[PDB]
Design a protein around this nucleic acid. Structure first.
Ligand SMILES: [Mn+2]
Length: 664
DNA sequence: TTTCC
């Protein structure tokens, strides 16, 4: 059923993905690599003291604080929704092998019994309306760029200077490129303006994954993670095989002499895509304005910030269903891409720009090194972009594509199983838009709060409410999938955007509260995803610019947690047993050091002015800029701090670009 | 020597 074309790094199609410079060449050839991360300055993730500390803390907490989740995934009691064995990973060493990314998800989707298009005319309107509401009256802003990010194919540059030129250039030739694409000359477009080529696969760590302790054997069990070998990936499942990767960390002893204590495993690795910046720029240019619109006008269902922010909305519900999507990104439907593009043209978006946007969602992928002696292969032909990988992370609007898909999907689940009486309100585009715009503002008897694949569905007192309960029940029994679009189910440990919904005996949205997930504190602090990169002079360019800072926001972030106090003590204690030092003290030092280093990067901070003027968010973001790509937005961060992490292109240059893209 | 609000 069309095996994807594949080329070796030596084939000219691959070669042309990397420019004639060291950086690029090196990325094309980068071989499999692993090794312990510098968890904190001077501390190796596999250091024996640490591993012991981890073994004792994890064992203890699990024992003394077992999960408090009811038959309905609602979490009550201690706020603990699972054991603490997730920290038992030798951070820095991946499971082998990683997965080859699947070239086409058509068969995957079909075998999962999910639709290949809007299933009913209503749905077709709803999705299309989502596009109309989202892409309509956008306000130009400057194109922000993450500092130290790679431009990937073809240059692989990190120099902000270069990135800016690259972007400004793209905005200037995007139009000419898109047209070249409309004429079917992708090679021309790639060669002339670097808009095309392929995504660069970078494997990322999932520092914590499930691990359980079989009471019978007294042995631990790492959650298996299925992976696709090359054959499977190119044949969309037809041939090849799918199997569990090996998380066994015994090899570490034999290979690096690293002592592996019982019950520790290699990390789970997820694929990630590095988009060719020349192409992603013009897209990001439009993407941010969209974020601004939906986060403002549709702030009810789309703009989420504090534990209290969310709590306010949910408290007024009579029923709150916390859903869960399976493998969101690889399931995302190419038809939604096409539908969106088509509707965009109807709204009146420059063809060339829509063509760029489309192409960006069907681009080939260059697999680096999923395992030793593997990779260096390009999937799909750049001359004629026709892949169906689902959502590709490095794409300029991945979050938007996911939200658009899922938000309408949940609204449909509600309509289908609990609110048929609302169907009559959706007769055509206008009536559809009207309905959706009211729905998104939280003004209907059915509601949702969401971001990509996380969401909470609500029902107020009313006609749909009885249906709501029925649906939730369909979900508990979980024998039938409530949607025709994605595989939905309820989240075992109902939580939204990092905060857990803590129900009391009543088990109701009004008497429930939002506490931080205590586990996430543990994961952030003892299982980071990247080391401290002390070798990188520019902390603003590091994955973890100022680690110590997160101590400051800790109380604010997780304090509301029921077992907070206990865990901090459990830690301090186990840390004493393992290092003969006070963990609190350790972090207070890191806090002081980092707070001082920070002022060097904040123009407005006196050369020793405290953390006075900074929000908890500011801190969590500075400690982990990644939270900016999944939890918060430029708007939730103090301006002077956002500047530290991002740098932008002139509003003039972008505003002019946008003006030629948008319809009105 | 490696992505995206
Ligand atoms: Mn959730």
């Amino acid at each position: 059923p069309r095996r994807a074309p594949a080329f070796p790094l030596s084939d000219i199609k691959a070669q042309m993905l990397f420019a004639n410079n060291i950086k690029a060449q090196q990325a094309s050839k980068r071989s499999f690599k692993e090794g312990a991360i510098e968890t904190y300055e001077g501390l190796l993730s596999v250091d024996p003291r640490f591993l012991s500390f981890k073994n004792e803390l994890s064992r203890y907490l699990t024992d003394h604080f077992p999960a408090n989740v009811d038959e309905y995934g609602r979490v009550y009691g201690n706020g603990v929704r699972t054991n603490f064995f997730g920290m038992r990973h030798m951070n820095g060493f991946p499971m082998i092998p990683a997965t080859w990314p699947l070239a086409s998800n058509l068969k995957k989707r079909a075998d999962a019994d999910l639709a290949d298009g809007p299933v009913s005319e209503r749905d077709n309107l709803l999705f299309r309306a989502a596009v109309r509401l989202m892409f309509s009256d956008l306000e130009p802003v400057p194109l922000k760029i993450r500092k130290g990010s790679s431009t990937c194919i073809p240059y692989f540059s990190n120099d902000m200077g270069t990135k800016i030129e690259i972007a400004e250039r793209a905005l200037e030739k995007a139009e000419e490129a898109g047209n070249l694409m409309l004429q079917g000359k992708f090679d021309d477009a790639y060669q002339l303006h670097q808009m095309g080529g392929a995504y660069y696969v970078v494997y990322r760590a999932q520092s914590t994954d499930a691990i359980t302790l079989d009471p019978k054997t007294g042995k631990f069990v790492s959650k298996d993670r299925m992976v696709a070998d090359f054959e499977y990936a190119v044949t969309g499942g037809e041939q090849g095989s799918l199997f569990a990767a090996s998380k066994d960390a015994s090899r570490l002893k034999e290979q690096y002499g690293i002592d592996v204590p019982d019950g520790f495993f290699c990390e789970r690795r997820r694929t990630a895509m590095g988009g060719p910046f020349a192409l992603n720029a013009p897209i990001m240019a439009v993407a941010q304005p969209v974020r601004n619109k939906i986060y403002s006008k549709y702030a009810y269902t789309f703009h989420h910030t504090t534990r209290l922010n969310k709590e306010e909305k949910v408290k007024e519900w009579s029923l709150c269903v916390a859903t869960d999507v399976s493998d969101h990104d690889t399931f995302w439907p190419g038809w939604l891409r096409d539908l969106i593009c088509d509707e965009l043209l109807n709204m009146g978006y420059a063809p060339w720009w829509v063509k760029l946007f489309e192409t960006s969602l069907k681009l080939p992928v260059y697999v680096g090194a999923p395992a030793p002696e593997q990779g260096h292969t390009l999937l799909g032909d750049p001359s004629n972009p026709d892949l169906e990988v689902g959502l590709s992370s490095g794409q300029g609007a991945t979050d938007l594509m996911g939200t658009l898909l899922m938000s309408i999907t949940y609204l449909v689940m509600q309509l289908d199983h609990t609110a048929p009486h609302l169907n009559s309100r959706i007769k055509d585009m206008p009536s559809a838009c009207r309905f959706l715009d009211s729905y998104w503002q939280g003004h209907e008897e059915i509601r949702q709060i969401s971001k990509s694949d996380d969401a909470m569905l609500g029902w107020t007192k009313g006609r749909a409410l009885v249906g709501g309960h029925r649906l939730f029940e369909m979900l508990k029994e979980g024998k039938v999938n409530p949607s025709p679009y994605m595989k939905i189910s309820y989240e075992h440990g109902g939580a939204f955007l990092g905060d857990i919904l803590l129900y009391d005996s009543r088990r109701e949205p009004g008497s429930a509260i939002f506490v931080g997930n205590i586990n996430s504190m543990l994961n952030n602090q003892f299982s980071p995803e990247y080391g401290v990169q002390s070798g990188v002079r520019d902390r603003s360019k590091r994955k973890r610019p100022f680690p110590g800072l997160a101590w400051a926001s800790m109380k604010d972030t997780y304090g509301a947690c029921p077992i907070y106090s206990d865990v901090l003590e459990a830690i301090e204690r186990c840390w004493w047993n393992a290092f003969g030092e006070s963990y609190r003290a350790y972090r207070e030092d890191m806090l002081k050091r980092d707070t001082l280093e920070l002022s060097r990067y904040v123009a407005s901070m006196a050369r020793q002015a405290g953390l006075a003027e900074l929000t908890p968010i500011d801190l969590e973001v500075l400690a982990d800029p990644n939270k900016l790509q999944y939890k918060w937005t430029e708007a939730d961060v103090s301006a002077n701090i956002h500047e530290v992490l991002m740098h932008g292109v002139s509003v003039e240059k972008t505003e002019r670009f946008l003006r030629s893209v948008m319809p009105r």
